[PDB]
Amino acid sequence: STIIFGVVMFTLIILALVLVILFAKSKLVPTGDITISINGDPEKAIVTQPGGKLLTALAGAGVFVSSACGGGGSCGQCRVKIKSGGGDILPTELDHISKGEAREGERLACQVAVKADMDLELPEEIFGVKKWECTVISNDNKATFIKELKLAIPDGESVPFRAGGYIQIEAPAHHVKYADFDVPEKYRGDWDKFNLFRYESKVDEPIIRAYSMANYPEEFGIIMLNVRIATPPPNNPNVPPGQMSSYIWSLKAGDKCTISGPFGEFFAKDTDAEMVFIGGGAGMAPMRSHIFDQLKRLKSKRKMSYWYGARSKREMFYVEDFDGLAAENDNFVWHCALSDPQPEDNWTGYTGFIHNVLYENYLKDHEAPEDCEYYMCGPPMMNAAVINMLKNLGVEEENILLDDF
Amino acid sequence: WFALYEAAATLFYTPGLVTKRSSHVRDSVDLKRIMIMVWLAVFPAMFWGMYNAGGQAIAALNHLYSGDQLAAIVAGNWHYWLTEMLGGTMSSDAGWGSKMLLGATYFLPIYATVFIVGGFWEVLFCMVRKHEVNEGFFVTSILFALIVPPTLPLWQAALGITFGVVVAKEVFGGTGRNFLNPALAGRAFLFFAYPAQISGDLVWTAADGYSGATALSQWAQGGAGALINNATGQTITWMDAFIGNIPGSIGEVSTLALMIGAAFIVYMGIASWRIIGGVMIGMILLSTLFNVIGSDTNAMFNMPWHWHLVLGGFAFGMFFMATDPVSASFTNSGKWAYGILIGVMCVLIRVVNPAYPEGMMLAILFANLFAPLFDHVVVERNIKRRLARYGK
Amino acid sequence: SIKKTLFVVIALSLVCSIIVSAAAVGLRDKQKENAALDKQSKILQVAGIEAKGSKQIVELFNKSIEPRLVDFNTGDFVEGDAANYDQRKAAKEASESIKLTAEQDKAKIQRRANVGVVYLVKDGDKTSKVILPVHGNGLWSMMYAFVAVETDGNTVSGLTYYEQGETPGLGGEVENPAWRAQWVGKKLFDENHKPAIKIVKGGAPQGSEHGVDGLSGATLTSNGVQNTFDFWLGDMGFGPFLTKVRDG
Amino acid sequence: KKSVLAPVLDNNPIALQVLGVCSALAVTTKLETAFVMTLAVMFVTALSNFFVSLIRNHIPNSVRIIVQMAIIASLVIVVDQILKAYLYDISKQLSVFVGLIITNCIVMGRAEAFAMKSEPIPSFIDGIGNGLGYGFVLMTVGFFRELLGSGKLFGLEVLPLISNGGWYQPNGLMLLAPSAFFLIGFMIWAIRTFKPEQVEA
Amino acid sequence: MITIKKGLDLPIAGTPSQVISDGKAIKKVALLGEEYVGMRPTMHVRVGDEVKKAQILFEDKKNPGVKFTSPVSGKVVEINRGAKRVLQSVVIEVAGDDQVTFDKFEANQLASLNRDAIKTQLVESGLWTAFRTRPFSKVPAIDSTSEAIFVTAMDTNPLAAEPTVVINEQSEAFVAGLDVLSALTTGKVYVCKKGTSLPRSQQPNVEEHVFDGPHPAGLAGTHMHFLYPVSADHVAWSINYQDVIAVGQLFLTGELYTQRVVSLAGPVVNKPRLVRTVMGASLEQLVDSEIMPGEVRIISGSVLSGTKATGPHAYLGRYHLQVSVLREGRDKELFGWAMPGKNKFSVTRSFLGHLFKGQVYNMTTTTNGSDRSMVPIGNYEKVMPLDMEPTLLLRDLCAGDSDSAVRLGALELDEEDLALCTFVCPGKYEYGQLLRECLDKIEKEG
Amino acid sequence: EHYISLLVKSIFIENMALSFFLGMCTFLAVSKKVKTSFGLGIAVIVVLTISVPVNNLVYNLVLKPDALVEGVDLSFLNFITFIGVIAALVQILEMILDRFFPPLYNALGIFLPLITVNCAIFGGVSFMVQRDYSFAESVVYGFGSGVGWMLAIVALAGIREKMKYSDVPPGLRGLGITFITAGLMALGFMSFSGVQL
Ligand SMILES: Cc1cc2nc3c(=O)[nH]c(=O)nc-3n(C[C@H](O)[C@H](O)[C@H](O)COP(=O)(O)OP(=O)(O)OC[C@H]3O[C@@H](n4cnc5c(N)ncnc54)[C@H](O)[C@@H]3O)c2cc1C
Ligand SMILES: CCCCCCCCCCCCO[C@@H]1O[C@H](CO)[C@@H](O[C@H]2O[C@H](CO)[C@@H](O)[C@H](O)[C@H]2O)[C@H](O)[C@H]1O
Ligand SMILES: Cc1cc2nc3c(=O)[nH]c(=O)nc-3n(C[C@H](O)[C@H](O)[C@H](O)CO)c2cc1C
Ligand code: FES
Ligand code: FES
Ligand SMILES: [K+]
Ligand code: NA
């Protein structure tokens, strides 16, 4: 008897609670599709139903916001200017946004949650993206762990980008075995020392990564780039191998990949001060464009310096180009130090890490290391060493630009 | 062993350090002096307290035992016959010296164990954490040893100080970094952990087998007319309590001694007269209120403010425990509110809390929790003026 | 899809409610028996009957204990469901309870039920002793105890505090067997038929007719226990009932 | 195994997370209550996760919070009936916290974070592990509070008491509110000095 | 007009004589890079170069357009740098009299000069570095402007010179400087002086405010709080009276005025007095044959807030108008913290010294203790007359809470404002550096 | 009257946070800034002041034994109704604030998702059932308990802010020291232990 009374009361109670909630939802949660103005252009204006994150809404339209960490608010590559709406800046956003930036209006599109009408002032790069499916031309290995990738524009013309930029390459799920990779006999022996071909990579889901360009703006038709193969740490074998760098290496002439337009905030200063470039590994790509940009695109007479930290002679590449540019123009001079020359290299120049060679050769006797732009690029270990040296030399952070990969 | 050695070397000799920047001249006041002035300020209360504890014990012993019965008791306790071997006498005709000596045998072991056990925790934390030993423990040890019954077991004192030093102070960084009062934190641990040894009628007098209520407990039972001392059968007048000729924890009985000690440090500015002024205002206002309301059943309602002052540990708590700069509010306006809360809370526990005869410790420990809030309220008001440019 | 949302909740609510209702209705009798057994054991313990296990406790309780309802106003037996009576609930309703005045409320109990429950212990076919539920406020919380009074109506056969919130060591000593065992042999009343139980502070004299040593350093709880007896043995408590016991 | 033991010391609901502390400060006075509370929390969390995961796909977001509350509340009530019918004395000792298992943050946290987006089987294992770790905190605190507070373990006299002609004087603070905080506070210190990875910056 | 009650007038022995006399001939001058907050030098000269009385020595990268000119004309004999190649000083050896010249105007026309013409002339001559923005104690940006310029015509620092004595000799220049400031300022000019009469400007913009009380009354930070409260968006400028005299001389004669009057005082100064010197004058030569034997510390500026004059830094500061020489108190005493302080000075009354009113103390550089955690015994509230909660603010600085420190008024404070709080701290903290570290964090993140 | 005694009982003598260990998770979580803790405290008062009286009506009208039908007691459907009613009211209050009271929604509506089915609310409701409280008594107890809880969280937040200058040993930093701080707070709050007001 009481069982029936309890069941009906239970069903009545739950129905009473949901009904007031559902009735409250209709009369308190206006579902009016939120309309966000993008750059103030009515055509760019996007109308979307309430809910989700600003990153998803923007991606739906023709505006694409560069994002690496995704919907986590961890990288900060999706910074947007929210003129109005969105509420106060979340505490998690402030970890990657300075207070001054918050005053201007910088916000992370992924982190911010869309709940009301907002005003946006997105830049041209986000406003418009040059998503193209370029065709792979050449994939020869420049060094032991570095490959030069040449891309053919599918739509003609050339990608609009500034020196030191990068392109966000998108790839789908794929399985690539390192044995599929093709390497020159010179670099094959070094690979055969440990026989890295045994590795196999299986990308279960599509991934998106960034790669700095290696072509100066005046170059039209072929988009030079340098790619470093991603491999498990030598001391931590229990790690899946490279997923994106492995996939790009597997490709050869005739393959196709998407660039999703250019991006990057790496550039030189339109001043008369001296430039001092220093690169390592994949970092030589942006540096090469910068040297070429300042030699013919701008024909700058400003003093130029290049120092490359290398482990062995086989690692070095593009040397002939550096020799020609240094020889053709005296304003630019290049040097390279070897941390461990091969016995057959017979190197008779600088030996050791650049962090101490550079100071003992150039910065020690220079009249103003601070009054010189520095463009650091290389493995994190070198960055920590050089930054400590540069800091011990008295160079402001604003005076030094670093692009870690 | 660098930390302890440096403290000993710096203790004997002032450091030869010189200013490195900013103000090249520094005020002569240092933490080492501030602690010693406070430590010396409680000496009059400590010395009288030893005399009082022995004097009360001797009267009770004579009043209870006599003849061969008394002699057997004396030989049965190490406190008594030790006093005899040093020239004291347990007879009623004992002079001030014997009374002071007997109290010393009851106080010094409590002070010694508290200092040794408390010191070990202080040095252990500083040694392990690579800090320099602070001198704030010197004040902490003595004050804890002066807010405990004379008959407190030594092992209880070691546990009490360990809680007061470790849990309340060291885990917060040490001297100047905690929010609670360490000495009262230790006593509150004893209060709730082993109430039988820090409450009742068998702890406040060092006479074996003697059961005698204190002035505060007696007042609650039967009001002013219930104030009688069973050791001598003489009525306890206000002068007796103010001077400190009453049973109770050593160091708190004498309000006159604490007033002399508290007056010196208040004059030197070490102890805030605002906190003391706040406590008095709180105690007077609430005690006077209870007088007006009256209570035909609760005798405590009719206790005047001046009786609240000289009874229990109110004087000791107001002077040498509520003035702890670290646990008090850091603003002058907040200090008044912090002091008033202590005075109000102490009277409330005394009157409307039958469980606890006295509440000065719980009043201070309760006030230490809200000291930041009185600071926060004052600060926010100041911030509001700043945003308005102070009406300029 | 509101139709789907209504379906999932309805089906989920029914199955969950059905299981809950079956468990609630199905196990209700068991829970009541468990609650009853807790008091039945204590009544046996004060009665001095050794029982262990639910089967023995219930069997012994039925055979040896005869609960009855007593009216405090007249101290006379009344007819009712003694086994299924809740005095605490009655004291909270004005229908079966009265509001004590300040003078009468010696034990500091807000209300006193008009009819109380007592448990007669019959060794054979005749009562040997009576157990009275006496409760009063202590220092922290209400203290409830069972007092065993012999057929004479004066001697107390035993005592047990089956519910008391007090500080262990000081006020919780009421649970101590030695202190409880001290009450055996004491006489509740005097020749004048007036309450005589006194809790002597610091220890009652040895061999005292009505002297029980008070709890050490716990005068507040000892005072509460004294008030509980001083009241329940008075006019408004079991006084009139106890007088009837003395003569039968 | 790794998932089962992960929330014991690596992702403890009370050491790392701040879920389930209401009961740890109350039902830890004795081991009998703490152990029985642990089983109730383990059983409820595991059962609630299994059912939420089973119906996770069809759960309506509009009433997902009420849906998970009902299943959790229903399971708690059934356990409550079992506790009252059997172990009635323990139910009295647990008092109202038996009914508060519905609000115990462990049940909602795992029923939402994991159960809603996991298969029924792994969700059930996760619930048991979360309760098992929460039990480790409960029993460790309960072991110290009961041993040093009463000289007993599971009601068995381990340290003879002076009241029973023994030698050990019970610590009255161990039976009060502050003792639970200090024991858990020092527990975290001990956990995090062996596992510095959890230290907060 | 305004009276300050809380504060600590240090009765350090060896006060000046308030008499202006010729100082020792100076053959070495320097510019101290560290003296300027947030200044990254862009060197415009090298060792061995020949500079003139106003030739630029270096620029500020983070304050473009601000030129630091050479105080005197000579040869750059060294560029002392330090850790991180931080520019400790740029030393010039005086030899010659060549000097740059600028436009000169009659005193009557100064008030009517265009604001931009005033700014460029000050920037060109390098006198623009005299100004300091209170919120961060940085030289004002060239394009920036402020509605309140505070002229500190009072010197309450211990052993400090009397501004009235100095100004009375340069009455015309001071009035001329005020007129230029009146035109430069967007709002008003506050001439914060004492009760003593000073030359007055007829311009309605200039206003005279009288401050009375202990030392804190004489600081520009104290004046700004009482007159023009400063915040993130309310910026005020500070300039000492001597610099104002230079401004007047600059616009009257068209030549940079570098002569200054500084009080060479201290316990070990045989004949303390005011001495005419030059900006950046080498203190080693200035105090030559004027100090008692023994190990002493030469300090540029007040002992409360000054710079140690050793090695590269042994030159008068840009904003320092006083030289204090103190004994080195490295001696260790037995139970020195327990003795009665007959000769010990303290804000608290725990020493016998306070009983003997009117005493003068031969203070040394000893810290009088070791570094300990702050134990607030009310000392801070006794020396801070501003409407702030000093104890809570100092706790925020110690903890590094920039956000809370700003809310409590850290922006309105300069390192000098906390000199007394450093002086009276039982824990022996250096709140000057803590505030500077906090202010830098606010600027960088801002 | 009797109501004023009840209000003081629910705040000081009986504190939900420290004396009952209710809502500790949200009491040891948002106890980092005074303002945010202040916001939760006022929000908990609103939820309690509306949950306790509403739950009192339902219990005395539906779940009370021998209330709807003689001989049948629906007490076994106690937790479902209390937890269900609490969840509904908190959500309803949040949505109306976000629609009609923008400024309050940020001040209060932000924390309601945290108070949803919180131990403080359920415990305060459950203790009402364990006693016999009239509608007037229930509302005062609901408001009183919430204020008492707000007092503990704000006091803890103030102490945690004062601890900005503390040097907590690593491992005790964050949660570990907060437990010890909460324990010390409980020790002080035990001053009102034996007060029958
Ligand atoms: C602006 C910008 C420019 C860049 N330019 C270049 C460039 O020119 N060239 C270049 O090579 N890179 C560049 N990068 C870095 C690039 O994003 C990738 O790090 C790189 O291309 C390798 O891709 P990956 O995803 O395989 O690396 P990851 O896999 O993310 O690298 C992680 C490391 O662990 C291994 N690993 C693989 N899978 C896993 C896993 N699941 N868990 C743990 N470890 C794993 C990898 O082998 C690698 O050693 C740039 C990045 C940025 C932001
Ligand atoms: C037992 C006796 C002691 C306890 C009783 C006394 C408690 C006193 C503390 C009350 C709580 C603190 O109250 C504090 O009030 C200040 C005003 O100064 C408020 O100050 C703040 O208010 C609003 C938010 O409401 C903010 O936007 C504003 O910037 C600021 O002024 C704090 O937000 C609040 O936290
Ligand atoms: C006036 C004054 C009173 C003090 N009172 C106490 C006290 O009651 N208990 C204590 O442990 N320390 C006391 N100290 C020492 C110290 O300040 C205290 O332990 C702080 O809590 C340490 O942070 C006192 C110090 C001073 C100057
Ligand atoms: S995508 Fe990384 S911060 Fe938004
Ligand atoms: S279990 Fe988290 S609030 Fe109670
Ligand atoms: K009392
Ligand atoms: Na006294």
Author numbering:
A (entry chain F): 2 to 406
B (entry chain B): 23 to 414
C (entry chain C): 7 to 254
D (entry chain D): 8 to 208
E (entry chain A): 1 to 446
F (entry chain E): 2 to 198
Give the original sentences from the paper that presented this experimental model:
The cryo-EM structures of Na+-NQR either isolated or bound to UQ-1 or UQ-2 represent the resting or oxidized state of the respiratory enzyme, in which NqrC resides at NqrB and NqrF flexibly adopts different conformations resulting in weak density for this subunit. The high-resolution cryo-EM structures reported here reveal the exact localization and nature of all cofactors, including a [2Fe-2S] cluster in subunits NqrD and NqrE. Moreover, two sodium ions were identified in NqrB. Two positions, Na-1 and Na-2, have been identified as ion-binding sites, with a coordination sphere of backbone carbonyls and water molecules that is typical of alkali metal ions. The map density, the average bond distances of 2.3–2.5 Å, and the coordination number of 4–5 are in excellent agreement with Na+. Both sites, Na-1 and Na-2, are located close to the periplasmic aspect. Of note, the access to the periplasmic half-channel to the solvent is blocked in the cryo-EM structures by NqrC.
In the human pathogen Vibrio cholerae, the sodium-pumping NADH:quinone oxidoreductase (Na+-NQR) generates a sodium gradient by a so far unknown mechanism. Na+-NQR is composed of three integral membrane subunits, NqrB, NqrD, and NqrE, and three hydrophilic subunits, NqrA, NqrC, and NqrF.
